[PDB]
Design an enzyme around this catalytic site. Sequence first.
Site, PDB file in Angstrom:
ATOM      1  CB  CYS B  19      50.859  67.507  47.110  1.00  0.00           C
ATOM      2  SG  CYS B  19      49.120  67.404  47.602  1.00  0.00           S
ATOM      3  CG  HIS B 298      59.239  65.154  53.837  1.00  0.00           C
ATOM      4  ND1 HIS B 298      58.937  66.452  53.485  1.00  0.00           N
ATOM      5  CD2 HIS B 298      60.575  65.018  53.656  1.00  0.00           C
ATOM      6  CE1 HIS B 298      60.039  67.073  53.107  1.00  0.00           C
ATOM      7  NE2 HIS B 298      61.048  66.224  53.201  1.00  0.00           N
TER       8      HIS B 298
END
Lengths: 332, 343, 334, 343, 74, 69, 74, 72
Positions: B19, B298
């Site tokens: 994450c 990202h």
Amino acid sequence: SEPGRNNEQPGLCGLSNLGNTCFMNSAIQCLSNTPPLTEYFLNDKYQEELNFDNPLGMRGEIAKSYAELIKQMWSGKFSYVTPRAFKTQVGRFAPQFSGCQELLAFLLDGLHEDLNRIRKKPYIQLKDADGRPDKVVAEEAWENHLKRNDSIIVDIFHGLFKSTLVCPECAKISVTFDPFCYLTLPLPMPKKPFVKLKDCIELFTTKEKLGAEDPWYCPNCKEHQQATKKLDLWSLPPVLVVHLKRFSDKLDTLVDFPINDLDMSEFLINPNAGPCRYNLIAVSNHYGGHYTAFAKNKDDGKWYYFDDSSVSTASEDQIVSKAAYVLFYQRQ
Amino acid sequence: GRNNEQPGLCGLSNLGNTCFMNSAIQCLSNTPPLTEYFLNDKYQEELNFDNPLGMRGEIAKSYAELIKQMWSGKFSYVTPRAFKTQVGRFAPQFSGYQQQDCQELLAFLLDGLHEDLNRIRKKPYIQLKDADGRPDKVVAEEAWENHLKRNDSIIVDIFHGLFKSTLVCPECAKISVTFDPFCYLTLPLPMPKKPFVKLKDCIELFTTKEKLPWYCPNCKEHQQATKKLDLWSLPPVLVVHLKRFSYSRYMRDKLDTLVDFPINDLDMSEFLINPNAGPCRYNLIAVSNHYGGMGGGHYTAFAKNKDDGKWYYFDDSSVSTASEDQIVSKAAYVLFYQRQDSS
Amino acid sequence: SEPGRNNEQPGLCGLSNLGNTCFMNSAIQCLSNTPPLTEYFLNDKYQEELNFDNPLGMRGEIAKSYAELIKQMWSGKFSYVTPRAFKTQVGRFAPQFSGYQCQELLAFLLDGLHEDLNRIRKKPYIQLKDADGRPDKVVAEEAWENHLKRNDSIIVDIFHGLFKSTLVCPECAKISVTFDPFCYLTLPLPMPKKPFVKLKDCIELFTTKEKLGAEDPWYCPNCKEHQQATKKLDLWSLPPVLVVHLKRFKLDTLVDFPINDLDMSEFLINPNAGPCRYNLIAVSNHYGGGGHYTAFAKNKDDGKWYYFDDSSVSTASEDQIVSKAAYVLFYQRQ
Amino acid sequence: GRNNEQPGLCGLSNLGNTCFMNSAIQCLSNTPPLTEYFLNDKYQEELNFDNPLGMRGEIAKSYAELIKQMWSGKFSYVTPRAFKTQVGRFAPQFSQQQDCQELLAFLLDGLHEDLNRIRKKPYIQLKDADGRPDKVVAEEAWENHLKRNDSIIVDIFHGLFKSTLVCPECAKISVTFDPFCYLTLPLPMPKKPFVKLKDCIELFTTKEKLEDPWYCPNCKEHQQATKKLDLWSLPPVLVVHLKRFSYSRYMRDKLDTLVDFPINDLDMSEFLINPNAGPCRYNLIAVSNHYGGMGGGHYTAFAKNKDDGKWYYFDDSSVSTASEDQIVSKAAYVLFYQRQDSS
Amino acid sequence: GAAMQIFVKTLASKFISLEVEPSDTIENVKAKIQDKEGIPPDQQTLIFARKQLEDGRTLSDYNIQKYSTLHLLL
Amino acid sequence: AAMQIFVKTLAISLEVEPSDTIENVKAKIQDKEGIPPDTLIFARKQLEDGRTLSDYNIQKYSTLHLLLR
Amino acid sequence: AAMQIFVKTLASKFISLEVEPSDTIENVKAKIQDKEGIPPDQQTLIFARKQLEDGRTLSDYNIQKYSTLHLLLR
Amino acid sequence: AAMQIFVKTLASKFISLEVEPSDTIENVKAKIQDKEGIPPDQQTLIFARKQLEDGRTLSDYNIQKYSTLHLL
Ligand SMILES: [Zn+2]
Ligand SMILES: [Zn+2]
Ligand SMILES: [Zn+2]
Ligand SMILES: [Zn+2]
């Protein structure tokens, strides 16, 4: 070993007392903690601009001496330094201080001329308004200023106000736009125990009758007259130096000034002035006497107290006091 | 890795799909009161090994040792394997491809750090009560002490605040008022999607009454009440989450609206309904960015280094200088604001 | 063939003294020279709007009596008239202004004219509701619709405006904001007595944060007790005719006010407001027992100023208007 | 022709091509100080029958008798034949077409000389500023003017300019104070669709480069100097001519710019360079309109009646009620403004 | 539910609380003031916004809002 | 004394004590609609078996979310 | 090229001078001596809170026409 | 005492004259005839958009020195 030499955080450096310098040490700490000025010297940007032959300069010695002192103070190698070389240049070119805020005025003007990019100055005939709109005259005034005055000091400290003079006999109105490198704010007379910094700014912009210090010749009356002068702020510099005029026997009035978010917008008569908010970066204190300084460190953002050679941590809550004398504000 | 470097200017190498673990760590790493607390070794005495809601100190222990590496000045980057394994052990939802609700990692970290350091070693059960017409200062005080009787930690000291909740029933029109703690703010964006919004508009939206699973005691059932929130007190460090994922479960359908937020001099006073609250001005200290892409996307971070006051950009193991002029972008996702003079 | 009855220019008509009337005659002359009010009555436009059963009205008798007086005064058949019928309605519905010991006569007349002409003939009861964080521009518009649901008349059209009222509890420190209608402004003068202020200084005193007194008890919902709040007023919208009462009760201060081009822009906190400049159309004078009142007024037909002292009407210059006797000012929006 | 009408609500029959005579008469007829002067028989004693620049009193006499008919209340319209006959005798230029805009200048100057109280005029050597203060030079110019020119027309219409001329060679500055009885305002070029009256006044006071032959005494030849005008004093009645004819001689190439001018509360205060002049606010009292068309076009007038204060429209013999809201149009050509409270 | 709380400032500058409906007459309000302060309604005069509340009128007629504080004079 | 809480199925009321195990609620859950105790969520945070709801400070009139599998 | 400037005496009287922008401060002190008979030895000239030093021209200080300098006796 | 004035031709170059304020316009036209070969029948003299008629002096119109008339 050596007295003063310790490994300290850059900029947290005191200045020993060398005789009685009036407000020199306090003034240096205020200028030392003006980030655009110190970064300019620390980055070796002054060598390119040193002026050794300016007729109003000090043959580059004030800028050279100041720059070299700043390099010591921000080297991280000293807990305090003895500014003998800088004091020697001040005593040599300004004996009037050997033995009070006009030392700051001398330093700003000396730094300016020792770094003035105008290297042969034209003679400029300044011009009154004649009905031309404020924006045309103000722009014209700034370029005329820049034709003789172009330096890191002008970029950082110089602004422009509008000056309205009225003849007592003739009643003719004359408008010029004049540069400044600091503001001297009057306090309310007679003493109030507490005043808001904005009240002092509004006193500054109130029509006042010129005294003996400003003899004025009326072009229409062909007569010297005691005009009425009115000042209005046209443009403000990135760093605004605000002098509280406490000597005119000293007024202890508590001037409450903001640490953050000083909004000068209501005082700008330029309709193209954008939002103008300022944060405090330094304060020179005067004790009725002795001078000290509060300053915000550019690297860690914390407040410190400078009493000659002593440097100690400080809180924003202890800055506003009756000792506040000169305030340094940096534009957001 | 081994490098003679500036403390805090330390990257975190990439380890799969975590994450926004690296981005979140850099934000917490550059929260000075948090990092100073760990660097000064005050967490050992406060480690709580029996908390029923904790990770029996393992999240705080690993995090502390990660922060010590990052601020030792011996590394240009480190590989946070130990911290990642402890996160996976207690929060598998943030492991690998099958990732869900990536935004709850910050909430997991704040709540996990809190419980592993909770000074209350045995928590009493407290019967909470809405205001009953009692004045706001009395009820908010009572709510804050009730919170502190079960929740007392460095995380509460740094991150916890209080808002006021006014709920309204469609029949009874009965108003029930609570004061509820929070450790971060989730700000809605204007709908339908606008290309540009100011941060205060999103805050101004957060405090607007919106309709929601609530049982009304007076009308005596479950109804769709309207809830209205007002900020009562703000923490020294304000964590601001911008709701960019309409489909939050899988990071799908992202709002790219450009939210303009101040780098300096955020004055929240106009949003505080507590009159006795002190000056609340904030400066930005960190930003988590999300760049869209296949997979979960990202994440990177902007953060201001506490020692030199300069901004830096953290992209996993890469650390580079940054200018405040590139911080405000549509990639901004989570904002860290610090109250002026908290450090 | 009566005294008073001569062939004169319409509107240049005095009012004889009948007993001894506080400022009735002066107030009438100010209203008589409010052109939109007089044009409304002279064009027979009030008959359709007469409300005879308003619980706060006077069974239409104040408006009917006033209309018939205005018709006499602007008929051009009188140099002066005896306002006996209108005085009788004032005495019958407001006995408080009889007996020789004053500005609330004007407040009574504006408010009485309004109810006698109120287009709302059964008023709904409305729960007024303060801002509670909503932006000014939404709460202000809501207040105006609430006002119009009970109050809709030529008087509202001409004289009513809206300011913002900010109250702060001294104990609890909570801020409660309402938007309240007004039909005139009462301006305070600086204390202690100054020899000269002009009008803008009085407006700035009016909008200055203000500590409620005995006649203004206030209940704080949060403290659930009564408190002495501080009230703050800011002008939101201004009427076509702005009636300005100088609070002299005496302060003999010379208030300098413009005859023309009174610019209210700096006092309007509404950004969506246009330029708001006013010209003077009438002035009520008070000469200090109980006092005698007179009036300056600009005649709508010829644009010249006249002086009204009961039954006497004479020509006037603008340069004699501003004096310490000025008490109530009538301004009409440009 | 003979009907029972309100005084001043009287038309003027059309008699061929009269330039803008009828419109000019209606504007002057509704200049109250001028009409009251004639209606009260104050011109009889002041008629000048020997003025070398006059018309043996025939213009004033004739104009007075026309005004007496128009304000007697016995006519809905009158035929200004007698006045037209005297205008043609001394000004044949208006019937062919020859600068119809100078008729107003002819009438104001003709009325002035036919009523000039100076009954043998001295020759007066006019006089530059030459470094002396403005108030001394301006008063000197006004007295020099009044020694040759003293009449009801001067009292009503005459004002004073400050004229600054600079030679391109010597850079010599010559300052004189010159009287005027009307202002001709330029419009912005190239043609704009909308302009405010104040913008035209500011162009009027803008320095221009010199068909005006001017001698520089020092630099030795005639030069095209730059002239700058400033309003020093303004008359009780300000006549403003909007220069709409780029080809003024034949009333061709008309600029249709919409000039927005106030009906009320025109503040000329910002344009007065005389500090001791008081506030000078003006209200509109009359407008001469020009409608383009075959040949010289057609002229009409708006005017405010002094007795009832209402606006009226005058189209030759037709008089009809008008609203202030229909006055500002591109047909507006000459504006008559009266200083507040001069009646 | 129609009911609401209003207040009346007594002569001693104390405040008296009453339960009231908008449809209550000024007479009903004066009667409640007698139930609490023992002052006959023939003697009472009620003021709000510089105005008598007159007998025969409801509190809806004057649009008396909840938490309004009337003035009691004698 | 006991208190009332609810667990809303994906498409229901309980009397409970703060000292009750999460399983007691889940032991109630088989007893509730025939649902074997083999996941309870409250406040976006998953409730573990072995913990009491006093551990989670579950208030009266609180509404839990029940998810299956 | 020439211009008029003034100097305020000790007695608060004013002296008129004809001057070029290129004339030195010494020379101005000499013109002040031609008019008030005061040796340049005892002359200090101040303008804009700044003392005019000898060796500099009035162009160096950008002295404008009708400027009024201050004269002080050393 | 007499003074110098000018008159601008069509071709926009000027002629200098000596005249007294007491000189009639017939002289000014005659002086233009005395030197420019232009008979007074030929000429109409205009100044300040206000046209001088014959029989008047230059004093009647207050013609100032260095005034420049227009010739038609
Ligand atoms: Zn003067
Ligand atoms: Zn309910
Ligand atoms: Zn309160
Ligand atoms: Zn020349």
